[PDB]
Symmetry: C2
Subunit: 146 residues, 2 copies
Protein backbone atom coordinates (compact mmCIF):
# COMPACT_ATOMS: atom_id res chain seq x y z
CA UNK A 1 0.00 0.00 0.00
CA UNK A 2 2.67 2.42 -1.25
CA UNK A 3 0.03 5.01 -2.29
CA UNK A 4 0.12 8.72 -1.54
CA UNK A 5 -0.08 9.94 2.03
CA UNK A 6 -3.35 11.49 3.22
CA UNK A 7 -2.11 15.05 3.58
CA UNK A 8 -4.09 18.27 3.17
CA UNK A 9 -3.04 21.88 2.55
CA UNK A 10 -5.60 24.41 3.85
CA UNK A 11 -5.82 28.21 3.45
CA UNK A 12 -8.21 31.17 3.37
CA UNK A 13 -8.58 33.56 0.48
CA UNK A 14 -10.84 36.59 0.25
CA UNK A 15 -13.41 36.88 -2.51
CA UNK A 16 -15.49 40.00 -2.68
CA UNK A 17 -18.05 38.45 -5.11
CA UNK A 18 -19.24 36.22 -2.29
CA UNK A 19 -19.84 39.01 0.27
CA UNK A 20 -20.95 39.19 2.87
CA UNK A 21 -19.38 35.74 3.40
CA UNK A 22 -16.35 36.46 1.30
CA UNK A 23 -13.70 34.45 3.13
CA UNK A 24 -13.35 31.14 1.30
CA UNK A 25 -11.62 28.32 3.19
CA UNK A 26 -10.03 25.98 0.62
CA UNK A 27 -8.55 22.54 1.28
CA UNK A 28 -6.60 20.50 -1.25
CA UNK A 29 -6.09 16.81 -0.59
CA UNK A 30 -2.55 16.51 -2.01
CA UNK A 31 -3.03 12.73 -2.52
CA UNK A 32 -5.93 13.21 -4.99
CA UNK A 33 -5.96 16.96 -5.75
CA UNK A 34 -9.62 16.96 -4.64
CA UNK A 35 -10.74 20.38 -3.46
CA UNK A 36 -13.19 21.28 -0.76
CA UNK A 37 -14.46 24.83 -0.31
CA UNK A 38 -16.70 26.61 2.23
CA UNK A 39 -17.59 30.29 2.79
CA UNK A 40 -17.31 32.37 5.96
CA UNK A 41 -18.08 35.96 7.14
CA UNK A 42 -14.99 36.15 9.33
CA UNK A 43 -11.64 34.43 9.50
CA UNK A 44 -11.63 33.03 13.12
CA UNK A 45 -10.33 29.77 14.58
CA UNK A 46 -13.78 28.42 14.65
CA UNK A 47 -14.45 29.15 10.93
CA UNK A 48 -11.32 26.97 10.28
CA UNK A 49 -12.75 24.11 12.39
CA UNK A 50 -16.16 24.31 10.79
CA UNK A 51 -14.39 24.23 7.38
CA UNK A 52 -12.44 21.13 8.34
CA UNK A 53 -15.42 19.31 9.87
CA UNK A 54 -17.07 19.57 6.41
CA UNK A 55 -13.88 18.58 4.59
CA UNK A 56 -13.62 15.57 6.87
CA UNK A 57 -17.12 14.40 6.14
CA UNK A 58 -16.36 14.74 2.42
CA UNK A 59 -12.79 13.43 2.12
CA UNK A 60 -12.36 11.31 5.26
CA UNK A 61 -9.93 12.18 8.08
CA UNK A 62 -6.38 13.05 7.03
CA UNK A 63 -3.18 12.10 8.74
CA UNK A 64 -1.96 15.62 8.76
CA UNK A 65 -2.96 19.07 7.68
CA UNK A 66 -0.42 21.64 6.44
CA UNK A 67 -1.21 25.35 6.86
CA UNK A 68 0.62 28.65 7.10
CA UNK A 69 0.94 30.55 10.33
CA UNK A 70 -2.26 32.48 10.06
CA UNK A 71 -3.50 32.89 13.64
CA UNK A 72 -6.75 30.96 13.05
CA UNK A 73 -4.63 27.89 12.43
CA UNK A 74 -2.21 28.38 15.32
CA UNK A 75 -4.52 29.33 18.20
CA UNK A 76 -4.89 26.93 21.15
CA UNK A 77 -8.47 26.40 20.13
CA UNK A 78 -7.58 24.94 16.70
CA UNK A 79 -4.71 22.97 18.31
CA UNK A 80 -7.07 21.32 20.65
CA UNK A 81 -9.71 20.76 17.89
CA UNK A 82 -7.16 18.90 15.81
CA UNK A 83 -5.77 16.96 18.80
CA UNK A 84 -9.38 15.85 19.48
CA UNK A 85 -9.67 14.46 15.98
CA UNK A 86 -6.19 12.85 16.02
CA UNK A 87 -4.92 15.01 13.12
CA UNK A 88 -1.29 16.12 12.93
CA UNK A 89 -0.51 19.64 11.80
CA UNK A 90 2.45 21.59 10.62
CA UNK A 91 3.06 25.19 9.56
CA UNK A 92 6.07 23.94 7.57
CA UNK A 93 9.56 25.53 7.76
CA UNK A 94 10.14 29.11 9.03
CA UNK A 95 9.86 31.25 5.90
CA UNK A 96 8.52 28.23 3.98
CA UNK A 97 9.03 29.78 0.55
CA UNK A 98 7.19 27.02 -1.35
CA UNK A 99 5.23 23.97 -0.20
CA UNK A 100 1.75 25.50 0.08
CA UNK A 101 1.80 25.66 -3.68
CA UNK A 102 -1.10 23.30 -4.50
CA UNK A 103 -3.37 25.28 -2.20
CA UNK A 104 -2.15 28.63 -3.61
CA UNK A 105 -2.75 27.35 -7.12
CA UNK A 106 -6.17 25.95 -6.12
CA UNK A 107 -7.21 29.37 -4.70
CA UNK A 108 -6.44 31.06 -8.02
CA UNK A 109 -8.28 28.42 -10.19
CA UNK A 110 -11.17 28.49 -7.83
CA UNK A 111 -11.44 32.30 -8.05
CA UNK A 112 -11.34 32.29 -11.85
CA UNK A 113 -14.05 29.58 -12.15
CA UNK A 114 -16.24 31.63 -9.74
CA UNK A 115 -15.73 34.73 -11.90
CA UNK A 116 -16.27 32.97 -15.22
CA UNK A 117 -19.39 31.15 -13.88
CA UNK A 118 -20.79 34.25 -12.19
CA UNK A 119 -20.31 36.34 -15.25
CA UNK A 120 -21.96 33.54 -17.30
CA UNK A 121 -25.13 34.15 -15.26
CA UNK A 122 -25.00 37.90 -15.70
CA UNK A 123 -23.45 38.87 -12.36
CA UNK A 124 -20.39 41.14 -13.02
CA UNK A 125 -19.88 42.29 -9.43
CA UNK A 126 -21.15 40.76 -6.24
CA UNK A 127 -23.26 37.69 -6.71
CA UNK A 128 -26.68 37.89 -5.03
CA UNK A 129 -26.61 36.13 -1.65
CA UNK A 130 -29.30 33.72 -2.70
CA UNK A 131 -27.33 32.44 -5.68
CA UNK A 132 -23.95 32.01 -3.91
CA UNK A 133 -24.30 28.58 -2.40
CA UNK A 134 -25.21 26.89 -5.66
CA UNK A 135 -22.62 28.92 -7.47
CA UNK A 136 -19.89 27.90 -5.02
CA UNK A 137 -21.06 24.27 -5.27
CA UNK A 138 -20.89 24.52 -9.06
CA UNK A 139 -17.31 25.89 -9.05
CA UNK A 140 -16.21 22.96 -6.80
CA UNK A 141 -17.93 20.35 -8.98
CA UNK A 142 -16.20 21.92 -11.98
CA UNK A 143 -12.69 21.74 -10.41
CA UNK A 144 -13.03 18.16 -9.09
CA UNK A 145 -15.06 16.43 -11.74
CA UNK A 146 -14.17 15.49 -15.21
CA UNK B 1 -16.57 -0.71 -17.69
CA UNK B 2 -19.35 -2.95 -16.35
CA UNK B 3 -19.38 -1.12 -12.98
CA UNK B 4 -22.46 0.09 -11.13
CA UNK B 5 -24.64 2.79 -12.63
CA UNK B 6 -24.43 6.30 -11.15
CA UNK B 7 -27.89 6.37 -9.59
CA UNK B 8 -29.00 8.26 -6.48
CA UNK B 9 -32.00 7.87 -4.16
CA UNK B 10 -32.95 11.13 -2.41
CA UNK B 11 -35.47 11.85 0.38
CA UNK B 12 -36.30 14.20 3.27
CA UNK B 13 -36.73 13.12 6.85
CA UNK B 14 -37.62 15.30 9.82
CA UNK B 15 -35.34 15.47 12.83
CA UNK B 16 -36.42 17.57 15.76
CA UNK B 17 -32.92 17.57 17.36
CA UNK B 18 -31.71 19.77 14.53
CA UNK B 19 -34.43 22.46 14.86
CA UNK B 20 -34.97 24.98 13.69
CA UNK B 21 -33.49 23.42 10.52
CA UNK B 22 -34.88 20.01 11.19
CA UNK B 23 -35.58 18.79 7.66
CA UNK B 24 -32.62 16.65 6.61
CA UNK B 25 -32.24 15.98 2.88
CA UNK B 26 -30.40 12.66 2.46
CA UNK B 27 -28.94 11.25 -0.76
CA UNK B 28 -27.53 7.76 -1.15
CA UNK B 29 -25.35 7.01 -4.15
CA UNK B 30 -26.54 3.43 -4.79
CA UNK B 31 -23.29 2.65 -6.68
CA UNK B 32 -21.08 3.29 -3.62
CA UNK B 33 -23.53 3.64 -0.69
CA UNK B 34 -21.94 7.05 -0.01
CA UNK B 35 -24.30 9.36 1.84
CA UNK B 36 -24.65 13.09 1.59
CA UNK B 37 -26.74 15.08 4.06
CA UNK B 38 -27.80 18.74 4.39
CA UNK B 39 -30.23 20.55 6.73
CA UNK B 40 -33.15 22.82 5.86
CA UNK B 41 -35.83 24.91 7.68
CA UNK B 42 -38.54 24.08 5.15
CA UNK B 43 -39.19 21.36 2.63
CA UNK B 44 -39.57 23.37 -0.66
CA UNK B 45 -38.45 22.65 -4.23
CA UNK B 46 -35.57 24.94 -3.80
CA UNK B 47 -34.30 23.21 -0.61
CA UNK B 48 -34.17 20.02 -2.79
CA UNK B 49 -32.10 21.81 -5.47
CA UNK B 50 -29.73 23.34 -2.95
CA UNK B 51 -29.33 19.82 -1.44
CA UNK B 52 -28.49 18.35 -4.81
CA UNK B 53 -26.10 21.13 -5.84
CA UNK B 54 -24.03 20.19 -2.74
CA UNK B 55 -24.36 16.45 -3.42
CA UNK B 56 -23.18 17.08 -6.96
CA UNK B 57 -20.09 18.94 -5.86
CA UNK B 58 -19.32 16.06 -3.48
CA UNK B 59 -20.21 12.96 -5.50
CA UNK B 60 -20.10 14.20 -9.12
CA UNK B 61 -23.20 14.41 -11.37
CA UNK B 62 -25.39 11.31 -11.49
CA UNK B 63 -27.12 9.83 -14.47
CA UNK B 64 -30.40 9.71 -12.71
CA UNK B 65 -31.97 10.50 -9.39
CA UNK B 66 -34.79 8.38 -7.91
CA UNK B 67 -37.24 10.03 -5.50
CA UNK B 68 -40.78 9.54 -4.25
CA UNK B 69 -43.61 11.78 -5.30
CA UNK B 70 -43.16 14.38 -2.64
CA UNK B 71 -44.17 17.68 -4.26
CA UNK B 72 -40.72 19.28 -3.84
CA UNK B 73 -39.38 16.66 -6.22
CA UNK B 74 -42.21 16.84 -8.76
CA UNK B 75 -42.75 20.59 -9.17
CA UNK B 76 -41.93 22.24 -12.51
CA UNK B 77 -39.16 24.11 -10.78
CA UNK B 78 -37.24 20.94 -9.79
CA UNK B 79 -38.00 19.44 -13.24
CA UNK B 80 -36.39 22.33 -14.93
CA UNK B 81 -33.45 22.38 -12.43
CA UNK B 82 -32.68 18.76 -13.24
CA UNK B 83 -33.18 19.24 -17.01
CA UNK B 84 -30.63 22.10 -16.76
CA UNK B 85 -28.09 19.77 -15.23
CA UNK B 86 -28.84 16.89 -17.64
CA UNK B 87 -30.01 14.56 -14.83
CA UNK B 88 -32.76 12.00 -15.40
CA UNK B 89 -35.35 11.46 -12.70
CA UNK B 90 -37.96 8.93 -11.82
CA UNK B 91 -40.54 8.58 -9.05
CA UNK B 92 -40.50 4.82 -9.70
CA UNK B 93 -43.68 2.71 -10.17
CA UNK B 94 -47.14 3.86 -8.94
CA UNK B 95 -47.34 2.52 -5.38
CA UNK B 96 -43.63 1.63 -5.53
CA UNK B 97 -43.71 -0.61 -2.47
CA UNK B 98 -39.93 -1.06 -2.27
CA UNK B 99 -37.04 0.46 -4.23
CA UNK B 100 -36.35 3.53 -2.07
CA UNK B 101 -35.03 1.11 0.50
CA UNK B 102 -31.37 2.22 0.65
CA UNK B 103 -32.47 5.79 1.29
CA UNK B 104 -35.06 4.70 3.89
CA UNK B 105 -32.43 2.62 5.63
CA UNK B 106 -29.89 5.49 5.39
CA UNK B 107 -32.39 7.90 7.05
CA UNK B 108 -32.76 5.56 10.04
CA UNK B 109 -28.96 4.96 10.50
CA UNK B 110 -28.33 8.62 10.10
CA UNK B 111 -30.90 9.49 12.80
CA UNK B 112 -29.47 6.98 15.27
CA UNK B 113 -25.86 8.20 14.78
CA UNK B 114 -27.09 11.80 15.35
CA UNK B 115 -28.82 10.70 18.57
CA UNK B 116 -25.93 8.60 19.85
CA UNK B 117 -23.39 11.36 19.00
CA UNK B 118 -25.55 14.14 20.42
CA UNK B 119 -26.16 12.28 23.60
CA UNK B 120 -22.39 11.58 23.80
CA UNK B 121 -21.89 15.35 24.07
CA UNK B 122 -24.55 15.77 26.72
CA UNK B 123 -27.42 16.99 24.53
CA UNK B 124 -30.53 14.79 25.23
CA UNK B 125 -33.05 16.97 23.40
CA UNK B 126 -32.46 19.63 20.80
CA UNK B 127 -28.85 20.22 19.96
CA UNK B 128 -27.76 23.86 20.31
CA UNK B 129 -27.82 25.59 16.92
CA UNK B 130 -24.14 26.38 17.11
CA UNK B 131 -23.13 22.74 17.50
CA UNK B 132 -25.37 21.30 14.74
CA UNK B 133 -23.24 21.79 11.67
CA UNK B 134 -20.23 20.01 13.10
CA UNK B 135 -22.45 17.37 14.59
CA UNK B 136 -24.16 16.72 11.26
CA UNK B 137 -20.75 16.63 9.55
CA UNK B 138 -19.55 14.14 12.14
CA UNK B 139 -22.54 11.80 11.63
CA UNK B 140 -21.87 11.80 7.84
CA UNK B 141 -18.15 11.11 8.28
CA UNK B 142 -19.10 8.25 10.59
CA UNK B 143 -21.51 6.63 8.07
CA UNK B 144 -19.20 6.96 5.03
CA UNK B 145 -15.77 6.39 6.46
CA UNK B 146 -14.22 3.30 7.81
Amino acid sequence: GLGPLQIWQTDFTLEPRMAPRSWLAVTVDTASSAIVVTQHGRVTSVAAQHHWATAIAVLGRPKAIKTDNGSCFTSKSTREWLARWGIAHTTGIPGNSQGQAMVERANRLLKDKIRVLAEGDGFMKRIPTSKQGELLAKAMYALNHF
